[PDB]
Each structure stands twice: as C-alpha cells, then as structure tokens.
PDB file of C-alpha atoms and ligand atoms in Angstrom:
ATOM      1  CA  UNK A   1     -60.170  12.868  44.871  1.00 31.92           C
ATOM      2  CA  UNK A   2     -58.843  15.226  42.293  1.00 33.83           C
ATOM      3  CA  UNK A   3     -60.837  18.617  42.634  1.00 33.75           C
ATOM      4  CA  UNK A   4     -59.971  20.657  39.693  1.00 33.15           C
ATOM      5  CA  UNK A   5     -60.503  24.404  40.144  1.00 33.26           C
ATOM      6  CA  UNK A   6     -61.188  27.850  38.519  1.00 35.40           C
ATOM      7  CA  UNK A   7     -60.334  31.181  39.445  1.00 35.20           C
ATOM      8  CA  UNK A   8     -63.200  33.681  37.917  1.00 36.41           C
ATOM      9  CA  UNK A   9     -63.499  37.916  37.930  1.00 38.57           C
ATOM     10  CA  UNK A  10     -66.336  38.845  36.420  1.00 40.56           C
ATOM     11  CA  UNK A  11     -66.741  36.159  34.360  1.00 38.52           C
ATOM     12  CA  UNK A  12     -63.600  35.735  33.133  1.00 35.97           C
ATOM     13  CA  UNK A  13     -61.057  32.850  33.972  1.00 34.33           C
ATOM     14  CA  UNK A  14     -57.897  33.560  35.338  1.00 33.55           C
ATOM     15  CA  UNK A  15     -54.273  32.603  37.281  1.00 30.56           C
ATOM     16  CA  UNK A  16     -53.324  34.465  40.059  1.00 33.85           C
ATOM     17  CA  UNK A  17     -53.029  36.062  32.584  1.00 32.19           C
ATOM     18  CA  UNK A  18     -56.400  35.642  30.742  1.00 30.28           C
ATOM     19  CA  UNK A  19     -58.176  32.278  30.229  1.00 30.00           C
ATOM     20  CA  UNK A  20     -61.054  33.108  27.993  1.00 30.14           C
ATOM     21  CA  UNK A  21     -64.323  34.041  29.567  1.00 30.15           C
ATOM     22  CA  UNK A  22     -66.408  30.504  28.926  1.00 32.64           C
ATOM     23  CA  UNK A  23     -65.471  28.507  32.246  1.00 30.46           C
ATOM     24  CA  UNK A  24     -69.143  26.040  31.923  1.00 30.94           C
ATOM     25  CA  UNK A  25     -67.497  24.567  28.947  1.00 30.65           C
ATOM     26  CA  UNK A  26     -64.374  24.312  31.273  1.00 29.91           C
ATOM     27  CA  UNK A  27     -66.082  22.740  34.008  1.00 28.72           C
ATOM     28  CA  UNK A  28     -68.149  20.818  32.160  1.00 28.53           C
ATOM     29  CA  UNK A  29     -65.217  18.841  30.534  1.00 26.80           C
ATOM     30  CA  UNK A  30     -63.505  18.728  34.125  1.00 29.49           C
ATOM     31  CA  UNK A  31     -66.860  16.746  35.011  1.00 28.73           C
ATOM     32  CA  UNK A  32     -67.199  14.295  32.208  1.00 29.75           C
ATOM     33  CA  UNK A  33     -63.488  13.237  32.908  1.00 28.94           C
ATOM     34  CA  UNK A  34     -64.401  12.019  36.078  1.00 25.80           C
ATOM     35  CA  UNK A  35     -64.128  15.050  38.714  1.00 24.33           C
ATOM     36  CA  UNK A  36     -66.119  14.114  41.349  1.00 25.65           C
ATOM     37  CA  UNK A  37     -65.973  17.641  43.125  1.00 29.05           C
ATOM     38  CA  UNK A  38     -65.275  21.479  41.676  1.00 28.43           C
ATOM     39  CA  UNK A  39     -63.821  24.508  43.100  1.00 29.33           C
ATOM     40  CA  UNK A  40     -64.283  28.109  42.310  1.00 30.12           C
ATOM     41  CA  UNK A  41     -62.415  31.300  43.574  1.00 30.90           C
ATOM     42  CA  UNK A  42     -65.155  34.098  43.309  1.00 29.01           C
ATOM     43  CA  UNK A  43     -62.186  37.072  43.313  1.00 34.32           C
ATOM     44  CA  UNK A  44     -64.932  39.875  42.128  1.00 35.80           C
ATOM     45  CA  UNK A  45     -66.699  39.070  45.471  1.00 33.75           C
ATOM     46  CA  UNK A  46     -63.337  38.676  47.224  1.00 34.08           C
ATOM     47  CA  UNK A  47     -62.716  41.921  46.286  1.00 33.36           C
ATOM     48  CA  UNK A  48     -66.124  43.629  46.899  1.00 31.55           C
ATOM     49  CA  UNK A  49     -68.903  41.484  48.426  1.00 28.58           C
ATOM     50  CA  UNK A  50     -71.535  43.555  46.764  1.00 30.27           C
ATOM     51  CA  UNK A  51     -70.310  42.428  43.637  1.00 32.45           C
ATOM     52  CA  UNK A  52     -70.377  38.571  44.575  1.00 33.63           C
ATOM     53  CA  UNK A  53     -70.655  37.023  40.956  1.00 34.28           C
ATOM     54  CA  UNK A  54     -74.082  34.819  42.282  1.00 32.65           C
ATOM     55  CA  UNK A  55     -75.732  35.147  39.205  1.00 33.25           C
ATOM     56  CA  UNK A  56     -72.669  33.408  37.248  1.00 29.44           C
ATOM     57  CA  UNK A  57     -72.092  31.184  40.044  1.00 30.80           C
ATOM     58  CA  UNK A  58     -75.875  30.177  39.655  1.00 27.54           C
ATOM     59  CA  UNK A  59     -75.741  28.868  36.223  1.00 26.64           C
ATOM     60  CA  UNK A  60     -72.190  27.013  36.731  1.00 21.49           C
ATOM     61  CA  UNK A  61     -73.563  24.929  39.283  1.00 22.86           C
ATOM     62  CA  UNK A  62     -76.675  24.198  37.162  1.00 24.06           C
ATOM     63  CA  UNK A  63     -74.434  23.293  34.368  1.00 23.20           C
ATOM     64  CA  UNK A  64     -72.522  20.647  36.177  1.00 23.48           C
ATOM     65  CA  UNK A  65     -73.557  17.632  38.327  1.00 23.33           C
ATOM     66  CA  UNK A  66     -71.213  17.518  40.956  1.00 26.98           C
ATOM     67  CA  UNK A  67     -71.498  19.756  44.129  1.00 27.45           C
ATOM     68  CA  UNK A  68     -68.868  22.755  43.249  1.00 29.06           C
ATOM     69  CA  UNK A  69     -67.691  24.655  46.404  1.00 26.67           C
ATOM     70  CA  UNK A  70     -67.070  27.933  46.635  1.00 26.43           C
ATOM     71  CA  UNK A  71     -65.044  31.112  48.204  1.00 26.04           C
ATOM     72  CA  UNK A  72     -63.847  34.313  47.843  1.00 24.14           C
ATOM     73  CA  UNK A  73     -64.925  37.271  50.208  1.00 23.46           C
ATOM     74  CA  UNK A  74     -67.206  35.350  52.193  1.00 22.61           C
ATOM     75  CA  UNK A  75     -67.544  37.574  55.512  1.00 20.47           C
ATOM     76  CA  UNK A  76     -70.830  37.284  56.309  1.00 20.20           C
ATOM     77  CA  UNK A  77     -73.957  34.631  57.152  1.00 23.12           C
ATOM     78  CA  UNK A  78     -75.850  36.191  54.268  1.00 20.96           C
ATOM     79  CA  UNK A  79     -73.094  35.319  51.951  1.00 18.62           C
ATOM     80  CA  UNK A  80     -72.830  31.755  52.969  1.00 17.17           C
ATOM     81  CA  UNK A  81     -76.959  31.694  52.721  1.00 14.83           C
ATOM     82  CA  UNK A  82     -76.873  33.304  49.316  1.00 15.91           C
ATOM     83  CA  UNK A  83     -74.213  30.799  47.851  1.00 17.07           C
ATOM     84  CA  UNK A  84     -76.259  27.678  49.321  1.00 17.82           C
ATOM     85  CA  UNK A  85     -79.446  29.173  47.792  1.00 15.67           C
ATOM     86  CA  UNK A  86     -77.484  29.756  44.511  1.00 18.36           C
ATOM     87  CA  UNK A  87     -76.777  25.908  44.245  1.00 22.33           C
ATOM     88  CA  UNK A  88     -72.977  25.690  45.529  1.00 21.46           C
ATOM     89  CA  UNK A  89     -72.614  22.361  47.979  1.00 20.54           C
ATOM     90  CA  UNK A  90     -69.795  23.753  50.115  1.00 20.37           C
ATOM     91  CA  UNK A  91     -68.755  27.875  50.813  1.00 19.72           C
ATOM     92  CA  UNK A  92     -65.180  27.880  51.087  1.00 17.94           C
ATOM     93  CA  UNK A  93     -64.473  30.481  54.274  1.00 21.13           C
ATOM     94  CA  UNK A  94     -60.622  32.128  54.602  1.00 20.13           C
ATOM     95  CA  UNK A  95     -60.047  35.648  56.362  1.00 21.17           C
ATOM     96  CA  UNK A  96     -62.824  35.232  58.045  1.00 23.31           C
ATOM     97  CA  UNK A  97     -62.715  31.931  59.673  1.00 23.16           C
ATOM     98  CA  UNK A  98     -59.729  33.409  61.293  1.00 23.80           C
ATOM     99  CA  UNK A  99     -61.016  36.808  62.142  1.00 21.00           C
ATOM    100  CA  UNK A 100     -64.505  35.597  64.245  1.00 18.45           C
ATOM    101  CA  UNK A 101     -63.735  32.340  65.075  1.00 18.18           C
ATOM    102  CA  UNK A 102     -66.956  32.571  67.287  1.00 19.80           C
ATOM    103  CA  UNK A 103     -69.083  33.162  64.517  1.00 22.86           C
ATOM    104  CA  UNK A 104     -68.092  30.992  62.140  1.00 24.55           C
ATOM    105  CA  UNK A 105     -68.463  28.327  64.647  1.00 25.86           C
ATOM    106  CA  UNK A 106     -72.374  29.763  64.856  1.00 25.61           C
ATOM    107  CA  UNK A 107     -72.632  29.243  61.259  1.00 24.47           C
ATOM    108  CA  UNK A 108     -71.353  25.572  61.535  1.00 24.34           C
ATOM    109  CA  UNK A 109     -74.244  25.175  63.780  1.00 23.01           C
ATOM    110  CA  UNK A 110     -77.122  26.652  61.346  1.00 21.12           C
ATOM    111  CA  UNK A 111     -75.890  25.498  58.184  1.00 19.85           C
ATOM    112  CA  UNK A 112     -74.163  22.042  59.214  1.00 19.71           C
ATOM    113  CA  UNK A 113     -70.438  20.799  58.530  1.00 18.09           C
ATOM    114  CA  UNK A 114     -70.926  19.442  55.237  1.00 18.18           C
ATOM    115  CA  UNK A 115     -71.646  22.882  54.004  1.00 18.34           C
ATOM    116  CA  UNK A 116     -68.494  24.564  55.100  1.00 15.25           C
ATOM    117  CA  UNK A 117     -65.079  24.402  54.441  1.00 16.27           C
ATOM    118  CA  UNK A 118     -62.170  26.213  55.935  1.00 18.31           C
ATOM    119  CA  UNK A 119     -59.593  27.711  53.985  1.00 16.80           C
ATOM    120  CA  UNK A 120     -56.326  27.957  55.526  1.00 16.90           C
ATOM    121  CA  UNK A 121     -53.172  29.267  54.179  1.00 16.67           C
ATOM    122  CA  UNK A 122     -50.102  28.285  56.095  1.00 20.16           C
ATOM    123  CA  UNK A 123     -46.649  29.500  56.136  1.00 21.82           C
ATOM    124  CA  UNK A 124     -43.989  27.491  58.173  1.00 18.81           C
ATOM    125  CA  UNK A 125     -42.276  29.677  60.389  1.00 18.97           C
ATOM    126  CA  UNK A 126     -38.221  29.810  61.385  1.00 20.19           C
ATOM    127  CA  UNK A 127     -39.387  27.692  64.438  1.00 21.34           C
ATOM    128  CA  UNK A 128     -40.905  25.121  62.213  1.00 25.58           C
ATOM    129  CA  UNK A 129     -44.642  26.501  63.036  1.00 23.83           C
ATOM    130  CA  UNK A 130     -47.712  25.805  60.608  1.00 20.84           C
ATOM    131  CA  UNK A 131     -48.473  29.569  61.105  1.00 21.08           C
ATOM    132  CA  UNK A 132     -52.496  30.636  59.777  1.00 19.07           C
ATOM    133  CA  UNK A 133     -52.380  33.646  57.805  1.00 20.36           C
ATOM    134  CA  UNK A 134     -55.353  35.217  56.079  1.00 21.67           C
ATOM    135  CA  UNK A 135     -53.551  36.319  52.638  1.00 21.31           C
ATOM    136  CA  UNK A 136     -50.274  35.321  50.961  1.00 24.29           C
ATOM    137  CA  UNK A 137     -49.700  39.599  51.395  1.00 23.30           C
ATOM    138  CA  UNK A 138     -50.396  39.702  54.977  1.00 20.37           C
ATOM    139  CA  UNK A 139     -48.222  39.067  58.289  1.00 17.60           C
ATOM    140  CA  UNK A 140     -48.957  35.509  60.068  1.00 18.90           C
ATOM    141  CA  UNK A 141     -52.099  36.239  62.301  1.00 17.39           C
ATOM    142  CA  UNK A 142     -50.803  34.560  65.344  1.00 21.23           C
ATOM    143  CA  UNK A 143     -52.465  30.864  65.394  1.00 24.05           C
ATOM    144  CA  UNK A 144     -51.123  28.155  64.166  1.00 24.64           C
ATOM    145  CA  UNK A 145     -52.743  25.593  61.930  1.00 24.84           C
ATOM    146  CA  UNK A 146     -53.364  23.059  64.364  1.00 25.22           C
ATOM    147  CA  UNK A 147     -54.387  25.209  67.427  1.00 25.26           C
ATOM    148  CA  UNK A 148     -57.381  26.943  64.421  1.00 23.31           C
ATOM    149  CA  UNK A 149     -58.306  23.604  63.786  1.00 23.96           C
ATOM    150  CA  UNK A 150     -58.708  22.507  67.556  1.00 22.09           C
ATOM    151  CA  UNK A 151     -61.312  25.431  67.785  1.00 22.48           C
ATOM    152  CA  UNK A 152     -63.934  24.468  65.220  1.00 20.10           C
ATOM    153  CA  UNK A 153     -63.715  20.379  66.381  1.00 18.33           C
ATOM    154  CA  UNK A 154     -66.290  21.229  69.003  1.00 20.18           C
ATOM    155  CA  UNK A 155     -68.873  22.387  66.533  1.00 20.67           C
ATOM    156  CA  UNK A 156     -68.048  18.952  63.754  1.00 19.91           C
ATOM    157  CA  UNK A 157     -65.223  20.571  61.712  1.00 18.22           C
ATOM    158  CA  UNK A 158     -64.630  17.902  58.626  1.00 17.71           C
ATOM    159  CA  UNK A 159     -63.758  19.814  55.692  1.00 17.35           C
ATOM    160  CA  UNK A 160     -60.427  22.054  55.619  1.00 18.24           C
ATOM    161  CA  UNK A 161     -58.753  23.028  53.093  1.00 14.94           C
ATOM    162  CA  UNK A 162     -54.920  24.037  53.671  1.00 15.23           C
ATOM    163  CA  UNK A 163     -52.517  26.371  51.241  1.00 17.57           C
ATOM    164  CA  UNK A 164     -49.244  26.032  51.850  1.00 18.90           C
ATOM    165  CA  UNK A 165     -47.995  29.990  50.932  1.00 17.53           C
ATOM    166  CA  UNK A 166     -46.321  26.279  46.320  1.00 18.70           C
ATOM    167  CA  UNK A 167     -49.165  28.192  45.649  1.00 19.23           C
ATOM    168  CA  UNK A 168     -49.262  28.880  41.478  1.00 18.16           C
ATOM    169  CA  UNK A 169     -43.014  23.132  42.623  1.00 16.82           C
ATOM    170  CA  UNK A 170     -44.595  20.107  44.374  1.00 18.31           C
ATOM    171  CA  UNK A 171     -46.723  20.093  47.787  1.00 16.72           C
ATOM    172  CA  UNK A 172     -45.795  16.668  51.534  1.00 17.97           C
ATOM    173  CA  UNK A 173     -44.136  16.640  54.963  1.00 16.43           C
ATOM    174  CA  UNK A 174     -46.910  19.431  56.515  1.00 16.41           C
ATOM    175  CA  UNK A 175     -50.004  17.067  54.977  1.00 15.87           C
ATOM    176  CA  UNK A 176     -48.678  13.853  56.782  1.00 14.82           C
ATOM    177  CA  UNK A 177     -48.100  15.822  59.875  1.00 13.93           C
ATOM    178  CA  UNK A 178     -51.866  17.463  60.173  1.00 13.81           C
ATOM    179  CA  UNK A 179     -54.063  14.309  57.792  1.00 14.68           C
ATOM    180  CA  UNK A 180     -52.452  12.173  60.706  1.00 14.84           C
ATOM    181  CA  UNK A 181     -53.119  14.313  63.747  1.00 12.27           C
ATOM    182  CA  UNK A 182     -57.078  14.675  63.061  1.00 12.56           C
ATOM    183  CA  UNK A 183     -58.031  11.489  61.369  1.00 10.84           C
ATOM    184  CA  UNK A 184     -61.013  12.845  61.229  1.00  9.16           C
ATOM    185  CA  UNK A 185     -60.790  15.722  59.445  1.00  5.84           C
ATOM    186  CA  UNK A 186     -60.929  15.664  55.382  1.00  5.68           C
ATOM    187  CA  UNK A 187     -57.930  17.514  54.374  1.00  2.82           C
ATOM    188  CA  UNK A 188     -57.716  19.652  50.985  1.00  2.41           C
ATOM    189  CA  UNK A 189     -54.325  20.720  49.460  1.00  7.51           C
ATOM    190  CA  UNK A 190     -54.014  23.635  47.388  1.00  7.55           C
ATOM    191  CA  UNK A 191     -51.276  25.138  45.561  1.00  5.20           C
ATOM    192  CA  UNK A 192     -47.713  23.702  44.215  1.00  5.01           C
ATOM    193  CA  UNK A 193     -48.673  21.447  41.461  1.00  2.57           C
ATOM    194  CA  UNK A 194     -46.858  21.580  38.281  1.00  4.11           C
ATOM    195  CA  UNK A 195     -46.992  18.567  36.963  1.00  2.89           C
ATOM    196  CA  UNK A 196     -48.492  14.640  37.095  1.00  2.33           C
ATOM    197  CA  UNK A 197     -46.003  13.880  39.934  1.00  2.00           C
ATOM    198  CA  UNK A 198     -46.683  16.764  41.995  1.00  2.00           C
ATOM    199  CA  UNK A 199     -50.245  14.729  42.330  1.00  2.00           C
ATOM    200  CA  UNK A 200     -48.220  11.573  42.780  1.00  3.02           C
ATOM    201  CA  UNK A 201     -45.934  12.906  45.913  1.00  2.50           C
ATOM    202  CA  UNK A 202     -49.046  14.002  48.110  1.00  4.95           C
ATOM    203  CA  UNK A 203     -50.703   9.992  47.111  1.00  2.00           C
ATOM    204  CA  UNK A 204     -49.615   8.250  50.713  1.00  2.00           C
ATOM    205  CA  UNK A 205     -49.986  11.624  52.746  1.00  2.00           C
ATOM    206  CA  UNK A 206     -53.821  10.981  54.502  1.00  2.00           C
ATOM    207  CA  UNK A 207     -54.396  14.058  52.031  1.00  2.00           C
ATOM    208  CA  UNK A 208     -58.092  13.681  51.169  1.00  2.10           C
ATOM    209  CA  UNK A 209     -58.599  16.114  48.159  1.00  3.85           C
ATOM    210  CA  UNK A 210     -56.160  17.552  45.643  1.00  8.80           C
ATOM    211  CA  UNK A 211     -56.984  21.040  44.458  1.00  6.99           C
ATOM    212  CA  UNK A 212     -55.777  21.948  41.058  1.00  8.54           C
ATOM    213  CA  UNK A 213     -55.737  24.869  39.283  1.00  9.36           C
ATOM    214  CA  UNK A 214     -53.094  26.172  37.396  1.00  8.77           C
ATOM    215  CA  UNK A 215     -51.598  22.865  35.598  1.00  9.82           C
ATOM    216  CA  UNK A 216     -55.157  22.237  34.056  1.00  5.19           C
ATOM    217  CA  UNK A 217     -54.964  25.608  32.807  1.00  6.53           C
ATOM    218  CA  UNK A 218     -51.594  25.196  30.867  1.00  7.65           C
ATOM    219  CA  UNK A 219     -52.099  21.795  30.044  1.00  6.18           C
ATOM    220  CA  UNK A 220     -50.019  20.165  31.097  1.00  6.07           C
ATOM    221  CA  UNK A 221     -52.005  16.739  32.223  1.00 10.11           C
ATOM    222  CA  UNK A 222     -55.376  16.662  32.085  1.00  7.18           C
ATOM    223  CA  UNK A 223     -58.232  15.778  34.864  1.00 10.64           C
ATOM    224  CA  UNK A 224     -58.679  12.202  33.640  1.00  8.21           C
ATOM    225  CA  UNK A 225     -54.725  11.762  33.926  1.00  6.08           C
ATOM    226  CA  UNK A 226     -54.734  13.780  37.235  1.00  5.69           C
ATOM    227  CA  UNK A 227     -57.116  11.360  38.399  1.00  6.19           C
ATOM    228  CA  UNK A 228     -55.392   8.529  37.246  1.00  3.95           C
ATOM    229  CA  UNK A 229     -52.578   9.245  38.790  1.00  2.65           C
ATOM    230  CA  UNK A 230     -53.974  10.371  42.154  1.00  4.79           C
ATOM    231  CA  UNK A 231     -55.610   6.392  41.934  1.00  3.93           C
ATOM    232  CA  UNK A 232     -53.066   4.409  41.533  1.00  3.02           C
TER     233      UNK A 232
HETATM  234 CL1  LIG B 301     -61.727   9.790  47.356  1.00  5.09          CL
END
C-alpha cells in the first residue's frame, strides 16, 4: 500500500515551508483516490506533549474512512490511550520505543499489536550497521535496527515503520535486507521519494507500506498514480 502522509503544527500543514492550514480537504482527496491507510506527524505534540493537537486529530479521523495512524511526542501510556480514544487506528511510537524498551513492550500487551507501530530511523554506519537513532539531530543510540526489532518479537511486534536518515533521492538495499529477515513483520518506508519511480524501486523489496509525504505536497504524482505505480 501507498500511505500518503501529512506533517501538521497547530493546524497547519507543513515539510520538514507552509501548506495551507485545511489538511481534511487534503486527506480527504488522498482517500477518495484510493489510500487505503493515512499518516500524520503531530509536531506541536512532538514538541510539547501538553499541546498534543487531539482535538484536530479528532475531527481528521472522523472526516476520513480509513484508519489514519499517528505520532509525534508520544512518551507516555496516556498519550497512546488518548490518541486511540480520539479515533486514530495505529500511534506511531519513535524516541521512545528506544528509550524504555520495557515499557513499550507493556503497552503492546494492553493495547495489542495492531495498535502500535514503531518508528525507527536508521542511519548505516562506516561498518555497514542499520544503526537506531531517535532524531535525524541526535548521535546513533547504540542498537541496531535488527537487534530493536528482536526485542519487541516476544510481545507480537507486526507493524514498523523504518526512516532511512532520503528523508525529504530514492529509498532499497536496507528494505530487502530487514522485509526478508522477519517475514513477519509489516515493514513501512519513509523518506526519499521524489518522484513516481522512487515508488517503483522499493516494488520487489518485501516493503509492505510506502509512506509519502513530500512529493504529494509538490505535486509531483498524485496518490491515484502513486498507487498505480506501487501495483503494477
Ligand atoms: Cl497491500
């Protein structure tokens, strides 16, 4: 699947310039043209949790029909409840599924696998390492993509999504490596697509979702020819 995505503070739509401040139109469209799944970065609440936009987030899921998932700041099991209560079908967790690997894996238990998805953003190291880090800004944290992923398959791990820090070029070695070592995993890419046959280079890979942001944005294909594309 094609999941097209937005990137929202407070209420406006934006690239990590100024997209207008009307994203359920956005979505909307995304939704009639086929998209089967949507993805928003919530970078108010990234920024400062208290200010989690739930109230926006609210009415974008009631204006679509198709589960939307959801990240940005998520630290703590209130913020996962309050985003499931708000309507969102999956919270999207980064930093934190990282920092307390422990208790993430408690809230795979409570809330169930199909509710979760882990965001990791990967840099490949000198020694040819998929190193986790938590930020594009930050040092590698000192796990690598494979050995992070190895520690939530004991509690039903299916959805991660990975970023390889392409990100706003092309994404396809790294997806073949991973979507081939856990079969059972769904695999999301995120990042590196500029145009049609960005989508087209990752069709083959065991890559389960395509994340795209950006190249909606600008227009340079839409989600109906993203989706044709990523068919076949
Ligand atoms: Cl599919």
């Amino acid at each position: 699947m094609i999941i097209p995505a937005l990137n929202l503070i407070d209420g406006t739509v934006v690239r990590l310039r100024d997209y207008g401040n009307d994203p359920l139109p956005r979505l909307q469209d995304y939704a009639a043209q086929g998209a089967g799944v949507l993805h928003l970065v919530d970078l108010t609440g990234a920024k400062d949790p208290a200010k989690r936009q739930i109230p926006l987030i609210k009415t974008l899921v009631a204006g679509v029909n198709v589960p939307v998932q959801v990240g940005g700041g998520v630290r703590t099991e209130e913020d996962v409840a309050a985003l499931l209560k708000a309507g969102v079908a999956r919270v999207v967790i980064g930093s934190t599924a990282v920092k307390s690997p422990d208790v993430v894996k408690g809230w795979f238990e409570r809330f169930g696998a199909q509710a979760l998805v882990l965001a990791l953003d990967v840099r490949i190291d000198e020694h040819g390492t998929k190193q986790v880090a938590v930020s594009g800004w930050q040092e590698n944290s000192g796990v690598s993509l494979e050995q992070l992923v190895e520690t939530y398959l004991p509690v039903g791990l299916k959805h991660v999504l990975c970023t390889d820090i392409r990100d706003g070029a092309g994404s396809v070695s790294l997806y073949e490596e991973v979507c081939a070592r856990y079969p059972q995993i769904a695999f999301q890419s995120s990042g590196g697509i500029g145009d049609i046959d960005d989508i087209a280079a990752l069709r083959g890979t065991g890559v389960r979702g395509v994340i795209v942001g950006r190249a909606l944005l600008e227009g340079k294909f839409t989600v109906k020819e993203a989706i044709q594309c990523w068919q076949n």
